[PDB]
Protein backbone atom coordinates (compact mmCIF):
# COMPACT_ATOMS: atom_id res chain seq x y z
CA UNK A 1 0.00 0.00 0.00
CA UNK A 2 2.88 2.50 0.79
CA UNK A 3 4.77 1.81 -2.44
CA UNK A 4 1.59 2.48 -4.51
CA UNK A 5 0.76 5.88 -2.74
CA UNK A 6 4.47 7.18 -2.96
CA UNK A 7 4.51 6.37 -6.62
CA UNK A 8 1.25 8.20 -7.04
CA UNK A 9 2.78 11.49 -5.48
CA UNK A 10 6.00 11.32 -7.59
CA UNK A 11 4.03 11.12 -10.96
CA UNK A 12 1.33 13.70 -10.33
CA UNK A 13 3.01 17.25 -9.66
CA UNK A 14 -0.37 18.99 -9.60
CA UNK A 15 -1.55 16.69 -6.72
CA UNK A 16 1.60 17.50 -4.77
CA UNK A 17 0.84 21.23 -5.07
CA UNK A 18 -2.79 20.58 -4.07
CA UNK A 19 -1.50 19.01 -0.91
CA UNK A 20 0.60 22.12 -0.27
CA UNK A 21 -2.27 24.58 -0.90
CA UNK A 22 -3.32 24.80 2.78
CA UNK A 23 0.21 25.64 3.66
CA UNK A 24 0.16 28.56 1.27
CA UNK A 25 -3.25 29.63 2.62
CA UNK A 26 -1.90 30.09 6.20
CA UNK A 27 1.60 31.50 5.30
CA UNK A 28 1.60 33.37 2.10
CA UNK A 29 -1.74 34.79 0.66
CA UNK A 30 0.05 36.46 -2.24
CA UNK A 31 1.60 33.16 -3.22
CA UNK A 32 -1.71 31.39 -2.98
CA UNK A 33 -3.26 34.08 -5.38
CA UNK A 34 -0.35 33.81 -7.62
CA UNK A 35 -0.32 30.03 -7.83
CA UNK A 36 -4.08 29.82 -8.36
CA UNK A 37 -4.05 32.94 -10.73
CA UNK A 38 -1.30 31.52 -12.95
CA UNK A 39 -3.26 28.37 -13.33
CA UNK A 40 -6.58 30.52 -14.11
CA UNK A 41 -4.84 33.00 -16.69
CA UNK A 42 -3.54 30.14 -18.57
CA UNK A 43 -7.12 29.17 -18.99
CA UNK A 44 -7.97 32.61 -21.44
CA UNK A 45 -11.30 33.45 -19.95
CA UNK A 46 -12.47 37.07 -21.43
CA UNK A 47 -14.22 38.42 -18.35
CA UNK A 48 -16.90 41.16 -19.39
CA UNK A 49 -17.19 43.87 -16.88
CA UNK B 1 -2.96 -1.70 12.31
CA UNK B 2 -1.51 1.37 13.87
CA UNK B 3 1.00 1.74 11.07
CA UNK B 4 -1.86 1.50 8.57
CA UNK B 5 -3.59 4.38 10.37
CA UNK B 6 -0.49 6.49 10.10
CA UNK B 7 -0.26 5.83 6.37
CA UNK B 8 -3.81 6.92 6.05
CA UNK B 9 -3.26 10.24 7.87
CA UNK B 10 -0.27 10.98 5.62
CA UNK B 11 -2.36 10.47 2.49
CA UNK B 12 -5.63 12.40 3.54
CA UNK B 13 -4.00 15.29 5.59
CA UNK B 14 -7.25 16.00 7.58
CA UNK B 15 -5.88 19.08 9.35
CA UNK B 16 -6.75 21.28 6.14
CA UNK B 17 -10.60 21.24 7.03
CA UNK B 18 -10.22 22.26 10.64
CA UNK B 19 -10.73 26.15 10.13
CA UNK B 20 -13.64 26.63 7.60
CA UNK B 21 -14.53 30.29 8.43
CA UNK B 22 -11.10 31.63 7.83
CA UNK B 23 -10.92 33.85 4.79
CA UNK B 24 -7.89 34.96 2.99
CA UNK B 25 -8.06 37.14 -0.16
CA UNK B 26 -11.91 37.31 0.45
CA UNK B 27 -12.26 33.43 -0.02
CA UNK B 28 -12.15 30.32 2.35
CA UNK B 29 -9.59 27.37 1.83
CA UNK B 30 -12.31 25.24 0.49
CA UNK B 31 -13.09 27.92 -2.01
CA UNK B 32 -9.59 28.19 -2.95
CA UNK B 33 -9.37 24.36 -3.36
CA UNK B 34 -12.45 24.45 -5.40
CA UNK B 35 -10.98 27.17 -7.54
CA UNK B 36 -7.94 25.06 -7.91
CA UNK B 37 -9.93 21.88 -8.78
CA UNK B 38 -11.92 23.94 -11.48
CA UNK B 39 -8.82 25.35 -12.89
CA UNK B 40 -7.06 21.96 -12.89
CA UNK B 41 -10.05 20.40 -14.52
CA UNK B 42 -10.16 23.27 -17.20
CA UNK B 43 -6.51 22.85 -17.91
CA UNK B 44 -6.85 19.14 -18.24
CA UNK B 45 -9.89 19.71 -20.67
CA UNK B 46 -7.89 22.30 -22.81
CA UNK B 47 -4.78 20.39 -22.85
CA UNK B 48 -6.64 17.55 -24.46
CA UNK B 49 -4.82 16.04 -21.78
CA UNK B 50 -7.46 13.57 -20.90
CA UNK B 51 -6.56 12.73 -17.56
CA UNK C 1 13.72 -24.52 14.97
CA UNK C 2 12.76 -22.49 17.96
CA UNK C 3 15.70 -20.05 17.35
CA UNK C 4 14.90 -19.65 13.69
CA UNK C 5 11.24 -18.80 14.28
CA UNK C 6 12.25 -16.24 16.90
CA UNK C 7 14.69 -14.52 14.47
CA UNK C 8 12.03 -14.35 11.72
CA UNK C 9 9.45 -12.78 14.04
CA UNK C 10 11.91 -10.03 15.18
CA UNK C 11 13.01 -9.13 11.62
CA UNK C 12 9.36 -8.64 10.41
CA UNK C 13 8.59 -6.37 13.38
CA UNK C 14 11.65 -4.11 12.71
CA UNK C 15 10.74 -3.73 9.01
CA UNK C 16 7.28 -2.66 9.89
CA UNK C 17 8.63 -0.01 12.40
CA UNK C 18 11.13 1.41 9.94
CA UNK C 19 8.54 1.94 7.29
CA UNK C 20 6.26 3.77 9.81
CA UNK C 21 8.96 6.21 10.81
CA UNK C 22 9.81 6.95 7.14
CA UNK C 23 6.19 7.89 6.43
CA UNK C 24 6.09 10.29 9.46
CA UNK C 25 9.26 12.08 8.25
CA UNK C 26 7.64 12.61 4.86
CA UNK C 27 4.35 13.95 6.36
CA UNK C 28 5.67 16.64 8.94
CA UNK C 29 8.08 18.97 7.17
CA UNK C 30 9.27 22.19 9.07
CA UNK C 31 6.95 24.36 6.92
CA UNK C 32 3.95 22.21 7.66
CA UNK C 33 4.77 21.96 11.31
CA UNK C 34 4.67 25.76 11.45
CA UNK C 35 1.21 25.84 9.84
CA UNK C 36 -0.03 23.11 12.18
CA UNK C 37 1.11 25.25 14.99
CA UNK C 38 -0.89 28.27 13.67
CA UNK C 39 -4.02 26.20 13.29
CA UNK C 40 -3.62 24.96 16.83
CA UNK C 41 -3.27 28.29 18.26
CA UNK C 42 -6.52 29.48 16.51
CA UNK C 43 -8.37 26.33 17.57
CA UNK C 44 -7.16 26.52 21.09
CA UNK C 45 -8.24 30.22 21.30
CA UNK C 46 -11.73 29.19 20.02
CA UNK C 47 -12.06 26.36 22.49
CA UNK C 48 -11.14 28.68 25.28
CA UNK C 49 -13.69 31.49 24.17
CA UNK C 50 -16.56 29.02 23.72
CA UNK C 51 -15.91 27.26 27.03
CA UNK C 52 -16.23 30.67 28.72
CA UNK C 53 -19.54 31.63 26.89
CA UNK C 54 -21.07 28.23 27.71
CA UNK C 55 -20.28 28.67 31.34
CA UNK C 56 -22.01 32.23 31.48
CA UNK C 57 -25.21 31.12 29.69
CA UNK C 58 -25.60 28.09 31.90
CA UNK C 59 -25.36 30.28 34.93
CA UNK C 60 -28.34 32.63 33.74
CA UNK C 61 -30.64 29.76 32.77
CA UNK C 62 -30.30 28.30 36.14
CA UNK C 63 -31.99 31.52 37.68
CA UNK C 64 -35.32 31.10 35.56
CA UNK C 65 -35.51 27.33 36.05
CA UNK C 66 -35.72 28.05 39.76
CA UNK C 67 -39.50 29.80 39.18
CA UNK C 68 -41.16 26.13 38.81
CA UNK C 69 -43.19 24.17 36.12
CA UNK C 70 -46.20 26.49 36.43
CA UNK C 71 -44.14 29.40 35.13
CA UNK C 72 -42.84 27.29 32.28
CA UNK C 73 -46.54 26.52 31.34
CA UNK C 74 -47.27 30.23 31.31
CA UNK C 75 -44.23 30.92 29.19
CA UNK C 76 -45.25 28.20 26.75
CA UNK C 77 -48.78 29.76 26.53
CA UNK C 78 -47.43 33.21 25.95
CA UNK C 79 -45.15 32.00 23.36
CA UNK C 80 -47.95 30.10 21.54
CA UNK C 81 -50.23 33.22 21.54
CA UNK C 82 -47.38 35.49 20.16
CA UNK C 83 -46.73 33.03 17.46
CA UNK C 84 -50.54 33.03 16.38
CA UNK C 85 -50.75 36.91 16.35
CA UNK C 86 -47.61 37.00 14.28
CA UNK C 87 -49.15 34.44 11.82
CA UNK C 88 -52.56 36.45 11.52
CA UNK C 89 -50.76 39.76 10.81
CA UNK C 90 -48.72 38.07 8.33
CA UNK C 91 -51.95 36.76 6.60
CA UNK C 92 -53.71 40.28 6.47
CA UNK C 93 -50.62 41.85 4.81
CA UNK C 94 -50.64 39.30 2.08
CA UNK C 95 -54.47 39.89 1.19
CA UNK C 96 -54.09 43.75 0.59
CA UNK C 97 -51.38 43.38 -2.11
CA UNK C 98 -53.86 41.29 -4.19
CA UNK C 99 -56.57 44.24 -4.90
CA UNK C 100 -56.49 44.29 -8.66
CA UNK D 1 20.50 -26.69 7.99
CA UNK D 2 18.59 -24.46 5.49
CA UNK D 3 16.94 -22.65 8.34
CA UNK D 4 20.22 -22.02 10.08
CA UNK D 5 21.49 -20.33 6.92
CA UNK D 6 18.36 -18.30 6.58
CA UNK D 7 18.64 -17.27 10.25
CA UNK D 8 22.01 -15.68 9.57
CA UNK D 9 20.52 -13.59 6.76
CA UNK D 10 17.69 -12.49 8.98
CA UNK D 11 19.99 -11.30 11.77
CA UNK D 12 21.93 -9.18 9.26
CA UNK D 13 18.74 -7.57 7.91
CA UNK D 14 17.54 -6.88 11.53
CA UNK D 15 20.72 -4.97 12.20
CA UNK D 16 20.15 -2.91 9.07
CA UNK D 17 16.59 -1.96 10.14
CA UNK D 18 17.68 -0.82 13.59
CA UNK D 19 20.11 1.52 11.93
CA UNK D 20 17.42 3.22 9.61
CA UNK D 21 14.92 3.59 12.55
CA UNK D 22 17.45 5.77 14.52
CA UNK D 23 18.23 7.85 11.57
CA UNK D 24 14.46 8.57 11.01
CA UNK D 25 13.73 9.40 14.72
CA UNK D 26 16.54 11.91 14.62
CA UNK D 27 15.06 13.70 11.48
CA UNK D 28 11.57 14.08 13.14
CA UNK D 29 12.94 15.61 16.24
CA UNK D 30 14.95 18.24 14.20
CA UNK D 31 11.68 19.38 12.38
CA UNK D 32 10.14 20.40 15.86
CA UNK D 33 7.35 17.77 15.55
CA UNK D 34 5.31 17.25 18.81
CA UNK D 35 2.36 15.00 19.31
CA UNK D 36 -0.25 17.74 19.58
CA UNK D 37 0.77 18.97 16.18
CA UNK D 38 -0.30 15.79 14.37
CA UNK D 39 -3.22 15.49 11.91
CA UNK D 40 -4.89 13.15 14.24
CA UNK D 41 -4.33 15.37 17.27
CA UNK D 42 -5.42 18.57 15.46
CA UNK D 43 -8.59 16.96 13.99
CA UNK D 44 -9.40 15.78 17.32
CA UNK D 45 -9.05 19.27 18.64
CA UNK D 46 -11.42 20.75 15.79
CA UNK D 47 -13.98 18.14 16.63
CA UNK D 48 -13.94 19.25 20.18
CA UNK D 49 -14.51 22.97 19.14
CA UNK D 50 -17.66 22.11 17.06
CA UNK D 51 -19.03 20.18 19.83
CA UNK D 52 -18.56 23.06 22.20
CA UNK D 53 -20.36 25.66 19.70
CA UNK D 54 -23.29 23.33 19.49
CA UNK D 55 -23.50 23.20 23.22
CA UNK D 56 -23.25 27.02 23.46
CA UNK D 57 -26.15 27.69 20.93
Author numbering:
A (entry chain B): 549 to 597
B (entry chain D): 616 to 666
C (entry chain C): 254 to 353
D (entry chain A): 173 to 229
Task: Provide excerpts from the study.
In mitosis, the augmin complex binds to spindle microtubules to recruit the γ-tubulin ring complex (γ-TuRC), the principal microtubule nucleator, for the formation of branched microtubules. The elongated structure of the augmin complex is characterised by extensive coiled-coil segments and comprises two structural elements with distinct but complementary functions in γ-TuRC and microtubule binding, linked by a flexible hinge. The augmin complex is recruited to microtubules via a composite microtubule binding site comprising a positively charged unordered extension and two calponin homology domains.
Since expression of the isolated TII tetramer is reportedly inefficient and structural characterisation by negative stain EM analysis failed, we opted for co-expression of all eight augmin subunits to reconstitute the augmin holocomplex. We subjected the negatively stained augmin particles to 3D classification to obtain a 3D reconstruction of the augmin holocomplex in a defined conformational state, in which the TIII tetramer could be unambiguously identified. The remaining density clearly reflected the clamp-like overall shape of the predicted TII tetramer models and the hammerhead-like region formed by the N-termini of TII HAUS proteins was recapitulated in the density, allowing us to confidently determine the orientation of TII in the 3D reconstruction. The approximate placement of the predicted TII tetramer into the negative stain 3D class indicated an interaction between the TIII H3/H5-arm and the TII C-clamp. Guided by these insights into the overall organisation of the augmin holocomplex, we used AlphaFold-Multimer to predict the structure of the TIII H3/H5-arm in combination with the TII tetramer. In all predicted models, the TII C-clamp interacts with the periphery of the TIII H3/H5-arm in a manner that is fully compatible with the negative stain 3D reconstruction of the augmin holocomplex, as judged by seamless fit of the composite TIII tetramer-TII C-clamp model into the EM density, thus providing an accurate model for the interface between the TII and TIII tetramers. We thus individually docked the TII N-clamp as a rigid body into the remaining density segments guided by the orientation of the N-clamp HH. The N-clamp is linked to the TII C-clamp by a hinge region, which allows for an opening and closing motion of the TII clamp, as suggested by the ensemble of predicted models.
